Design an enzyme around this catalytic site. Structure first.
Site, PDB file in Angstrom:
ATOM      1  CG  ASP A  92      -1.964   1.061   1.216  1.00 53.12           C
ATOM      2  OD1 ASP A  92      -2.133   1.682   0.203  1.00 53.12           O
ATOM      3  OD2 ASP A  92      -2.516   1.342   2.277  1.00 53.12           O
ATOM      4  CB  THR A 100      -6.468   1.916  -0.369  1.00 53.10           C
ATOM      5  OG1 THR A 100      -5.457   2.810   0.088  1.00 53.10           O
ATOM      6  CG2 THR A 100      -6.061   0.493  -0.059  1.00 53.10           C
ATOM      7  CG  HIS A 123      -1.509   8.624   4.832  1.00 53.50           C
ATOM      8  ND1 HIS A 123      -2.139   9.580   4.075  1.00 53.50           N
ATOM      9  CD2 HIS A 123      -1.862   7.424   4.326  1.00 53.50           C
ATOM     10  CE1 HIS A 123      -2.846   8.993   3.135  1.00 53.50           C
ATOM     11  NE2 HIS A 123      -2.694   7.655   3.265  1.00 53.50           N
ATOM     12  CG  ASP A 156      -2.416   0.654  -2.968  1.00 54.94           C
ATOM     13  OD1 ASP A 156      -1.335   1.257  -2.920  1.00 54.94           O
ATOM     14  OD2 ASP A 156      -3.170   0.513  -2.002  1.00 54.94           O
ATOM     15  CG  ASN A 186     -24.672   6.797 -22.859  1.00 53.21           C
ATOM     16  OD1 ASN A 186     -23.589   7.006 -23.415  1.00 53.21           O
ATOM     17  ND2 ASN A 186     -25.332   5.663 -22.993  1.00 53.21           N
ATOM     18  CG  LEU A 219     -19.084   1.834 -24.052  1.00 57.06           C
ATOM     19  CD1 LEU A 219     -20.074   0.737 -23.677  1.00 57.06           C
ATOM     20  CD2 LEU A 219     -17.758   1.230 -24.458  1.00 57.06           C
ATOM     21  CG  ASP A 241     -23.649   8.525 -27.496  1.00 53.62           C
ATOM     22  OD1 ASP A 241     -23.233   7.788 -26.558  1.00 53.62           O
ATOM     23  OD2 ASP A 241     -23.907   9.748 -27.377  1.00 53.62           O
TER      24      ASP A 241
HETATM   25  C1  LIG Z   1     -15.214  -1.826 -19.047  1.00 51.59           C
HETATM   26  O1  LIG Z   1     -15.546  -3.237 -19.023  1.00 51.59           O
HETATM   27  C2  LIG Z   1     -16.884  -3.543 -18.622  1.00 51.59           C
HETATM   28  C3  LIG Z   1     -17.108  -5.064 -18.539  1.00 51.59           C
HETATM   29  O2  LIG Z   1     -16.938  -5.648 -19.833  1.00 51.59           O
HETATM   30  C4  LIG Z   1     -17.882  -2.854 -19.567  1.00 51.59           C
HETATM   31  O3  LIG Z   1     -19.105  -2.836 -18.836  1.00 51.59           O
HETATM   32  C5  LIG Z   1     -20.135  -3.639 -19.391  1.00 51.59           C
HETATM   33  O4  LIG Z   1     -20.741  -2.889 -20.446  1.00 51.59           O
HETATM   34  C6  LIG Z   1     -21.984  -3.309 -21.039  1.00 51.59           C
HETATM   35  C7  LIG Z   1     -22.678  -2.084 -21.719  1.00 51.59           C
HETATM   36  O5  LIG Z   1     -22.737  -0.848 -20.919  1.00 51.59           O
HETATM   37  C8  LIG Z   1     -22.947  -3.971 -20.024  1.00 51.59           C
HETATM   38  O6  LIG Z   1     -23.847  -4.861 -20.741  1.00 51.59           O
HETATM   39  C9  LIG Z   1     -25.221  -4.681 -20.287  1.00 51.59           C
HETATM   40  O7  LIG Z   1     -25.542  -5.657 -19.294  1.00 51.59           O
HETATM   41  C10 LIG Z   1     -26.797  -5.445 -18.651  1.00 51.59           C
HETATM   42  C11 LIG Z   1     -26.867  -6.396 -17.443  1.00 51.59           C
HETATM   43  O8  LIG Z   1     -25.710  -6.166 -16.606  1.00 51.59           O
HETATM   44  C12 LIG Z   1     -25.631  -6.965 -15.390  1.00 51.59           C
HETATM   45  O9  LIG Z   1     -24.902  -8.207 -15.563  1.00 51.59           O
HETATM   46  C13 LIG Z   1     -23.449  -8.182 -15.579  1.00 51.59           C
HETATM   47  C14 LIG Z   1     -22.891  -9.627 -15.728  1.00 51.59           C
HETATM   48  O10 LIG Z   1     -22.929 -10.462 -14.540  1.00 51.59           O
HETATM   49  C15 LIG Z   1     -22.909  -7.404 -14.352  1.00 51.59           C
HETATM   50  O11 LIG Z   1     -21.475  -7.282 -14.333  1.00 51.59           O
HETATM   51  C16 LIG Z   1     -23.530  -5.998 -14.286  1.00 51.59           C
HETATM   52  O12 LIG Z   1     -22.916  -5.269 -13.186  1.00 51.59           O
HETATM   53  C17 LIG Z   1     -23.182  -3.832 -13.143  1.00 51.59           C
HETATM   54  O13 LIG Z   1     -24.299  -3.446 -12.334  1.00 51.59           O
HETATM   55  C18 LIG Z   1     -24.228  -3.910 -10.974  1.00 51.59           C
HETATM   56  C19 LIG Z   1     -25.477  -3.430 -10.215  1.00 51.59           C
HETATM   57  O14 LIG Z   1     -26.567  -3.163 -11.112  1.00 51.59           O
HETATM   58  C20 LIG Z   1     -22.923  -3.462 -10.273  1.00 51.59           C
HETATM   59  O15 LIG Z   1     -22.721  -4.282  -9.105  1.00 51.59           O
HETATM   60  C21 LIG Z   1     -21.665  -3.494 -11.169  1.00 51.59           C
HETATM   61  O16 LIG Z   1     -20.629  -2.636 -10.646  1.00 51.59           O
HETATM   62  C22 LIG Z   1     -21.969  -3.055 -12.606  1.00 51.59           C
HETATM   63  O17 LIG Z   1     -22.194  -1.623 -12.593  1.00 51.59           O
HETATM   64  C23 LIG Z   1     -21.655  -0.960 -13.761  1.00 51.59           C
HETATM   65  O18 LIG Z   1     -22.295  -1.327 -15.013  1.00 51.59           O
HETATM   66  C24 LIG Z   1     -23.673  -0.896 -15.151  1.00 51.59           C
HETATM   67  C25 LIG Z   1     -24.283  -1.446 -16.459  1.00 51.59           C
HETATM   68  O19 LIG Z   1     -24.787  -2.789 -16.295  1.00 51.59           O
HETATM   69  C26 LIG Z   1     -23.751   0.647 -15.011  1.00 51.59           C
HETATM   70  O20 LIG Z   1     -25.097   1.148 -15.083  1.00 51.59           O
HETATM   71  C27 LIG Z   1     -23.116   1.104 -13.679  1.00 51.59           C
HETATM   72  O21 LIG Z   1     -23.108   2.536 -13.594  1.00 51.59           O
HETATM   73  C28 LIG Z   1     -21.692   0.557 -13.538  1.00 51.59           C
HETATM   74  O22 LIG Z   1     -20.872   1.195 -14.518  1.00 51.59           O
HETATM   75  C29 LIG Z   1     -25.069  -6.126 -14.216  1.00 51.59           C
HETATM   76  O23 LIG Z   1     -25.474  -6.719 -12.965  1.00 51.59           O
HETATM   77  C30 LIG Z   1     -27.900  -5.613 -19.710  1.00 51.59           C
HETATM   78  O24 LIG Z   1     -29.163  -5.413 -19.058  1.00 51.59           O
HETATM   79  C31 LIG Z   1     -27.700  -4.640 -20.902  1.00 51.59           C
HETATM   80  O25 LIG Z   1     -28.680  -4.846 -21.976  1.00 51.59           O
HETATM   81  C32 LIG Z   1     -29.499  -3.687 -22.368  1.00 51.59           C
HETATM   82  O26 LIG Z   1     -29.100  -3.083 -23.613  1.00 51.59           O
HETATM   83  C33 LIG Z   1     -29.360  -3.866 -24.791  1.00 51.59           C
HETATM   84  C34 LIG Z   1     -28.807  -3.161 -26.030  1.00 51.59           C
HETATM   85  O27 LIG Z   1     -28.825  -4.057 -27.150  1.00 51.59           O
HETATM   86  C35 LIG Z   1     -30.857  -4.127 -24.954  1.00 51.59           C
HETATM   87  O28 LIG Z   1     -31.097  -5.001 -26.066  1.00 51.59           O
HETATM   88  C36 LIG Z   1     -31.428  -4.773 -23.699  1.00 51.59           C
HETATM   89  O29 LIG Z   1     -32.858  -4.822 -23.830  1.00 51.59           O
HETATM   90  C37 LIG Z   1     -31.010  -4.027 -22.423  1.00 51.59           C
HETATM   91  O30 LIG Z   1     -31.825  -2.832 -22.329  1.00 51.59           O
HETATM   92  C38 LIG Z   1     -32.909  -2.923 -21.362  1.00 51.59           C
HETATM   93  O31 LIG Z   1     -32.593  -2.246 -20.143  1.00 51.59           O
HETATM   94  C39 LIG Z   1     -32.392  -0.837 -20.321  1.00 51.59           C
HETATM   95  C40 LIG Z   1     -31.826  -0.249 -19.026  1.00 51.59           C
HETATM   96  O32 LIG Z   1     -32.423  -0.871 -17.879  1.00 51.59           O
HETATM   97  C41 LIG Z   1     -33.713  -0.199 -20.783  1.00 51.59           C
HETATM   98  O33 LIG Z   1     -33.569   1.205 -21.040  1.00 51.59           O
HETATM   99  C42 LIG Z   1     -34.217  -0.858 -22.066  1.00 51.59           C
HETATM  100  O34 LIG Z   1     -35.521  -0.354 -22.391  1.00 51.59           O
HETATM  101  C43 LIG Z   1     -34.234  -2.381 -21.925  1.00 51.59           C
HETATM  102  O35 LIG Z   1     -35.319  -2.773 -21.065  1.00 51.59           O
HETATM  103  C44 LIG Z   1     -26.241  -4.713 -21.434  1.00 51.59           C
HETATM  104  O36 LIG Z   1     -25.989  -5.866 -22.260  1.00 51.59           O
HETATM  105  C45 LIG Z   1     -22.297  -4.705 -18.830  1.00 51.59           C
HETATM  106  O37 LIG Z   1     -23.244  -4.813 -17.750  1.00 51.59           O
HETATM  107  C46 LIG Z   1     -21.089  -3.986 -18.253  1.00 51.59           C
HETATM  108  N1  LIG Z   1     -20.432  -4.803 -17.222  1.00 51.59           N
HETATM  109  C47 LIG Z   1     -19.812  -4.283 -16.139  1.00 51.59           C
HETATM  110  C48 LIG Z   1     -19.074  -5.252 -15.244  1.00 51.59           C
HETATM  111  O38 LIG Z   1     -19.784  -3.084 -15.868  1.00 51.59           O
HETATM  112  C49 LIG Z   1     -17.523  -1.389 -19.846  1.00 51.59           C
HETATM  113  O39 LIG Z   1     -18.317  -0.868 -20.919  1.00 51.59           O
HETATM  114  C50 LIG Z   1     -16.041  -1.180 -20.156  1.00 51.59           C
HETATM  115  N2  LIG Z   1     -15.700   0.241 -20.237  1.00 51.59           N
HETATM  116  C51 LIG Z   1     -15.145   0.781 -21.325  1.00 51.59           C
HETATM  117  C52 LIG Z   1     -14.955   2.279 -21.308  1.00 51.59           C
HETATM  118  O40 LIG Z   1     -14.832   0.118 -22.300  1.00 51.59           O
HETATM  119  O1  LIG Z   2      -7.493  -3.638   5.497  1.00 51.10           O
HETATM  120  C1  LIG Z   2      -7.221  -3.679   4.318  1.00 51.10           C
HETATM  121  C2  LIG Z   2      -6.797  -4.840   3.507  1.00 51.10           C
HETATM  122  C3  LIG Z   2      -6.546  -6.186   3.764  1.00 51.10           C
HETATM  123  N1  LIG Z   2      -6.156  -7.062   2.837  1.00 51.10           N
HETATM  124  C4  LIG Z   2      -6.011  -6.559   1.602  1.00 51.10           C
HETATM  125  N2  LIG Z   2      -5.608  -7.427   0.653  1.00 51.10           N
HETATM  126  C5  LIG Z   2      -5.415  -7.047  -0.730  1.00 51.10           C
HETATM  127  C6  LIG Z   2      -6.708  -7.067  -1.544  1.00 51.10           C
HETATM  128  C7  LIG Z   2      -6.209  -7.328  -2.938  1.00 51.10           C
HETATM  129  C8  LIG Z   2      -6.823  -7.100  -4.162  1.00 51.10           C
HETATM  130  C9  LIG Z   2      -6.165  -7.398  -5.342  1.00 51.10           C
HETATM  131  C10 LIG Z   2      -4.890  -7.916  -5.283  1.00 51.10           C
HETATM  132 CL1  LIG Z   2      -4.049  -8.286  -6.761  1.00 51.10          CL
HETATM  133  C11 LIG Z   2      -4.255  -8.135  -4.076  1.00 51.10           C
HETATM  134  C12 LIG Z   2      -4.929  -7.858  -2.898  1.00 51.10           C
HETATM  135  C13 LIG Z   2      -4.471  -7.998  -1.475  1.00 51.10           C
HETATM  136  N3  LIG Z   2      -6.219  -5.281   1.220  1.00 51.10           N
HETATM  137  C14 LIG Z   2      -6.626  -4.436   2.181  1.00 51.10           C
HETATM  138  C15 LIG Z   2      -6.935  -2.978   2.097  1.00 51.10           C
HETATM  139  N4  LIG Z   2      -7.300  -2.633   3.475  1.00 51.10           N
HETATM  140  C16 LIG Z   2      -7.705  -1.286   3.921  1.00 51.10           C
HETATM  141  C17 LIG Z   2      -6.541  -0.282   3.944  1.00 51.10           C
HETATM  142  O2  LIG Z   2      -7.130   0.491   2.869  1.00 51.10           O
HETATM  143  C18 LIG Z   2      -8.354  -0.287   2.952  1.00 51.10           C
HETATM  144 CA   LIG Z   3      -3.680   2.530  -0.586  1.00 52.23          CA
HETATM  145 CA   LIG Z   4     -22.093   6.445 -25.033  1.00 54.92          CA
HETATM  146 ZN   LIG Z   5      -3.188   5.963   2.148  1.00 50.22          ZN
END
Ligand SMILES: *[C@@H]1O[C@H](CO)[C@@H](O[C@@H]2O[C@H](CO)[C@@H](O[C@@H]3O[C@H](CO[C@H]4O[C@H](CO)[C@@H](O)[C@H](O[C@H]5O[C@H](CO)[C@@H](O)[C@H](O)[C@@H]5O[C@H]5O[C@H](CO)[C@@H](O)[C@H](O)[C@@H]5O)[C@@H]4O)[C@@H](O)[C@H](O[C@H]4O[C@H](CO)[C@@H](O)[C@H](O)[C@@H]4O[C@H]4O[C@H](CO)[C@@H](O)[C@H](O)[C@@H]4O)[C@@H]3O)[C@H](O)[C@H]2NC(C)=O)[C@H](O)[C@H]1NC(C)=O
Ligand SMILES: O=C1c2cnc(N[C@@H]3Cc4ccc(Cl)cc4C3)nc2CN1C1COC1
Ligand SMILES: [Ca+2]
Ligand SMILES: [Ca+2]
Ligand SMILES: [Zn+2]
Ligand SMILES: [Cl-]
Ligand code: NA
Ligand code: NA
Length: 804
Positions: A121, A159, A265, A308, A685, A689, A691
């Site tokens: 860290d 972190t 720190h 990190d 949006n 990606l 539009d």
């Molecule tokens: C970096 O890499 C990542 C990973 O590859 C890229 O992100 C992906 O991008 C895709 C497009 O934006 C996206 O695909 C969509 O998936 C939707 C379902 O997603 C869920 O499932 C996955 C898989 O397990 C999961 O990882 C997702 O996790 C997100 O959300 C949860 C909580 O909700 C969080 O815990 C998590 O952090 C993550 O959040 C992030 O992503 C979401 C987007 O899902 C953001 O909103 C957050 O802010 C945050 O960034 C999900 O649990 C799926 O529903 C989508 O399909 C829609 O679009 C198609 C278009 O053809 C349409 O046909 C469908 O009908 C559908 O639309 C319908 O829903 C609309 C909205 O509700 C509605 O308006 C319409 O009318 C329809 O009803 C889509 O396929 C994928 O989820 C994410 N994955 C991750 C991990 O983020 C990212 O783009 C890369 N970045 C760059 C810059 O390259």
């Molecule tokens: O108390 C803890 C603590 C304990 N264990 C960890 N393990 C790390 C988590 C992680 C993720 C990816 C990879 Cl490749 C290696 C590792 C190892 N990390 C943390 C961070 N943290 C607080 C201090 O700032 C938040």
């Molecule tokens: Ca740190």
């Molecule tokens: Ca866009």
């Molecule tokens: Zn620190």
């Protein structure tokens, strides 16, 4: 509730977490206040310390001892790490000459080389040079293995965001850990460093390496360690797990050190007090490597030493106070420190206005040490907008500074001398990467790279298929001896049309005029050859970009430039041109100032019109290929084609004109020619990606001409600048930018001055990777080079940072 009445007898640092109300014996039970009554007694033994001495060699096993020096210890897998050194006359790993590991040398029953991640860290990149005298174990890893001069963290350089990026390959906007502190308005819940909410699974998106492993039948050690478990015990736990039977033994492990961040720190990055922390980390690495050597794993295991983020000099006296800017300071909530995030204190306050807050925080004091942004206006390289946990209003704080709401927040909380969190291109925030082992290269230096790339590589090292992530898989193949991932180039989805002359001038009613009615068999065939692409080899050096989505577009050739013109968006997706070192800049002639010309290759109905720009009192227009760099007066007329025109705010045209008139030629002079690809970006949006048309929120008034959010340029040349850009034999050099298309220059506090005092500063802030532009355009660049594809992937992830 926990029934702590159970026992950790035979369960110490068990890998499978048992569920409530059963008591726990895993390396996190402490963090949940859930350990069995006897965990400390049995699992956290301390007796006699961490080192064998002469007198303990061949001792009678005493199970109370923290580690063992008895003859049975190797077979039990619980010797002190220095046991073979003290008792069996072996050398420390660090004292051994470094010898190439051409192949894994693993004990029988090891299916694959294990991976151990040694994570530290706050380990600033420059500690590798500046601390080299007190870190012999780490410097042997670095010098004998594969190392980068530094690794770039993600923003914010905090972190949990960076450790979870390491684990997932995702930007914080995607994995959901967007700060050390967060409010989720959907959940109505707050994440903090202190407390129990942060353990809730709903905060943590993506799929971290330990889950990816488990799902694909690779067993994993637990990555998080309770703060109270000493480092010596962490190392001993890892080494014990490595003596488990084959069917039970993890293949991936993580160690974590709170140092050097903790002391950093308090004392600042280079405080005299920082030497001892660095020595202590090094000794811990020594312990591990000695322990692996004992187990005959030191030429089998792949070890990653990774940080990190870094550490900057920050003191309480360098705090900006929003109370010195806002009248309304009590109507906001600020997330403070090395970044600022602002939202309304109450969602029932209808008098809250973000516009007025931004304006009160914009260029108000001469030396102001923060800049306000609406999050969609942040540099696209930060990838910090597409999450509901990121507040609309963001403050980018200058290195060495803090922002707070009011002075009393500082002193009713100087203490601290270091901090991190700043922009991830800041030198002090950079951290470290070393890879050592059979799968990594021998004595190899690699260029700096971003930590989003590591997940892919860790998956490669373990034979796992990575979950979808923001790495570019294959971009780090040059780190690896074996297990490289050999991708194919994406297939082009849309093939271009190659239109000829299909329209008479009089078919167009665009409301454009040009003074071009000025009249030769010698040169008449010549211009025919230019329009069919006789100069395209000069201007399109790396092949045409591939369009990776379904659309309708035309390739247009010209003397001085080539374009891929979208019939849907009514403008180029890309414009490609080469400017040699010897090229001359010219003016736009007086008579051609307002010249726009119909393109007789493109139908009126797929063309822009001038009347829309006349009627739109806010929107003007610019050109993608610059008329200033025309090769001849006759060629200059091509630059005024309606198919080269794009919508530009007058404020943005100041920026664009200076880039095209001054900077392109400057770069050609400096780099021995440049190839430029320019075009528009539509990201309304703010998801990073491309539009679709139905996502465009703004058009030129009264028209179907969509308004870009951003303009990009990719500027490529020969890495060997003794060769001109257009005759390069070897590797390439690139710099790129994604400039926000804004109706004002409020971002640039000195914009009332000459462009020579602010424009290039703006562009450097908005530096980009070619890969950033690919995501935003759906284009794939560098399709036709003489370079290996992995090398091109590396080029596409390069960021030109402009730090010293
Ligand atoms: C970096 O890499 C990542 C990973 O590859 C890229 O992100 C992906 O991008 C895709 C497009 O934006 C996206 O695909 C969509 O998936 C939707 C379902 O997603 C869920 O499932 C996955 C898989 O397990 C999961 O990882 C997702 O996790 C997100 O959300 C949860 C909580 O909700 C969080 O815990 C998590 O952090 C993550 O959040 C992030 O992503 C979401 C987007 O899902 C953001 O909103 C957050 O802010 C945050 O960034 C999900 O649990 C799926 O529903 C989508 O399909 C829609 O679009 C198609 C278009 O053809 C349409 O046909 C469908 O009908 C559908 O639309 C319908 O829903 C609309 C909205 O509700 C509605 O308006 C319409 O009318 C329809 O009803 C889509 O396929 C994928 O989820 C994410 N994955 C991750 C991990 O983020 C990212 O783009 C890369 N970045 C760059 C810059 O390259
Ligand atoms: O108390 C803890 C603590 C304990 N264990 C960890 N393990 C790390 C988590 C992680 C993720 C990816 C990879 Cl490749 C290696 C590792 C190892 N990390 C943390 C961070 N943290 C607080 C201090 O700032 C938040
Ligand atoms: Ca740190
Ligand atoms: Ca866009
Ligand atoms: Zn620190
Ligand atoms: Cl934060
Ligand atoms: Na106008
Ligand atoms: Na300004």
């Amino acid at each position: 509730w926990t029934a702590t009445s159970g026992s950790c007898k035979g369960r110490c640092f068990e890998l499978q977490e048992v569920g409530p109300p059963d008591c726990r014996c895993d390396n996190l039970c402490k963090s949940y206040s859930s350990c069995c009554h006897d965990f400390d007694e049995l699992c956290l033994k301390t007796a006699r310390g961490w080192e064998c001495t002469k007198d303990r060699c061949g001792e009678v096993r005493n199970e109370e001892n923290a580690c063992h020096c008895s003859e049975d210890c190797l077979s039990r897998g619980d010797c002190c790490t220095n046991y073979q050194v003290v008792c069996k006359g072996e050398s420390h790993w660090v004292d051994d000459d470094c010898e190439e590991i051409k192949v894994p040398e693993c004990p029988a029953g090891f299916v694959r080389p294990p991976l151990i991640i040694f994570s530290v860290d706050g380990f600033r990149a420059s500690y590798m040079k500046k601390g080299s005298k007190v870190m012999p174990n780490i410097e042997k890893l670095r010098s004998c293995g594969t190392h980068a001069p530094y690794m770039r963290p993600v923003y914010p350089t905090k972190t949990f965001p960076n450790l979870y990026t390491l684990a997932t390959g995702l930007y914080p906007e995607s994995h959901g850990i967007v700060g050390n502190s967060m409010y989720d308005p959907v959940f109505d819940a707050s994440f903090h460093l202190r407390g129990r909410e942060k353990f809730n699974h709903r905060w943590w998106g993506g799929q971290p390496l330990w889950i990816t492993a488990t799902k694909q039948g690779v067993r994993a050690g637990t990555f998080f360690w309770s703060v109270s478990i000493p480092h010596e015990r962490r190392i001993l736990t890892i080494l014990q797990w490595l003596s488990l039977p084959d069917n039970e033994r993890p293949s991936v492990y993580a160690f974590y050190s709170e140092q050097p961040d903790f002391s950093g720190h308090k004392y600042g990055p280079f405080g005299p007090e920082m030497t001892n922390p660095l020595r202590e980390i090094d000794k811990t690495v020594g312990q591990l490597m000695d322990g692996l050597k004992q187990l005959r794993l030191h030429r089998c295991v792949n070890v990653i030493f990774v940080g990190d983020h870094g550490m900057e000099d920050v003191t309480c006296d360098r705090t900006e106070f929003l109370s010195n800017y806002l009248t309304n300071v009590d109507d906001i909530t600020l997330v403070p420190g090395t970044l600022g995030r602002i939202r309304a204190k109450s969602i029932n306050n209808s008098k809250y206005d973000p516009k007025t807050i931004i304006a009160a925080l914009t260029c108000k004091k001469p030396d102001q040490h923060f800049k306000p942004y609406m999050k969609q206006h942040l540099p696209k390289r930060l990838h910090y907008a597409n999450n509901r946990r990121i507040e609309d209003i963001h403050l980018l704080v200058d290195r060495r500074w803090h922002v707070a709401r009011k002075p009393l927040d500082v002193y009713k909380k100087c203490f601290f001398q270091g901090d991190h969190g700043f922009d991830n291109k800041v030198n002090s925030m950079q951290t470290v990467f070393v890879g050592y082992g059979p799968t990594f290269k021998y004595r190899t230096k690699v260029p700096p790279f971003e930590n989003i790339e590591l997940y892919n590589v860790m998956c490669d090292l373990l034979g796992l298929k990575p979950a979808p992530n923001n790495g570019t898989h294959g971009s780090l193949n040059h780190l690896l001896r074996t297990n490289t991932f050999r991708p194919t180039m994406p297939d082009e989805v849309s093939r271009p049309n190659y239109p000829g002359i299909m329209y008479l001038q009089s078919e167009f009613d665009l409301g454009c005029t040009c003074d071009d009615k000025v009249e030769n068999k010698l040169e008449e065939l010549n211009k025919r050859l230019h329009t069919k692409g006789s100069t395209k080899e000069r201007h399109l050096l790396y092949g045409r970009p591939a369009v990776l989505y379904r659309t309708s577009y035309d390739i247009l050739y010209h003397t001085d430039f080539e374009s891929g013109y979208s019939e849907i968006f009514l403008m180029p997706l890309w414009t490609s041109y080469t400017i040699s070192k010897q090229a001359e800049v010219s003016s736009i002639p007086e008579h051609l100032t307002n010249c726009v010309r119909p393109d007789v290759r493109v139908s009126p109905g797929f063309s822009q019109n001038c009347l829309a720009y006349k009627n739109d009192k806010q929107m003007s227009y610019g050109f993608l290929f610059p008329p200033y760099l025309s090769s001849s007066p006759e060629a200059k007329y091509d630059a005024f084609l309606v198919t080269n025109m794009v919508p530009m705010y007058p404020a943005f045209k100041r920026v664009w004109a200076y880039f095209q008139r001054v900077l392109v030629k400057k770069y050609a002079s400096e780099r021995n020619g440049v190839n430029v690809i320019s075009g528009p970006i539509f990201d309304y949006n703010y998801d990073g990606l491309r539009d679709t048309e139905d996502e465009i929120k703004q058009y030129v008034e009264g028209s179907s001409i969509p308004v870009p959010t951003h303009y990009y340029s990719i500027i490529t040349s020969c890495l060997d600048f003794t060769q001109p850009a257009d005759k390069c034999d070897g590797p390439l050099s690139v710099s790129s930018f994604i400039l926000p298309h804004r109706p004002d220059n409020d971002e640039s506090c000195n914009s009332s001055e000459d462009e020579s005092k602010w424009v290039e500063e703006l562009m450097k802030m908005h530096t980009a990777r070619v890969r950033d532009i690919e995501h935003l355009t759906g284009l794939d660049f560098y399709r036709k080079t003489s370079r290996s594809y992995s090398e091109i992937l590396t080029l596409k992830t390069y960021l030109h940072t402009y730090e010293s």
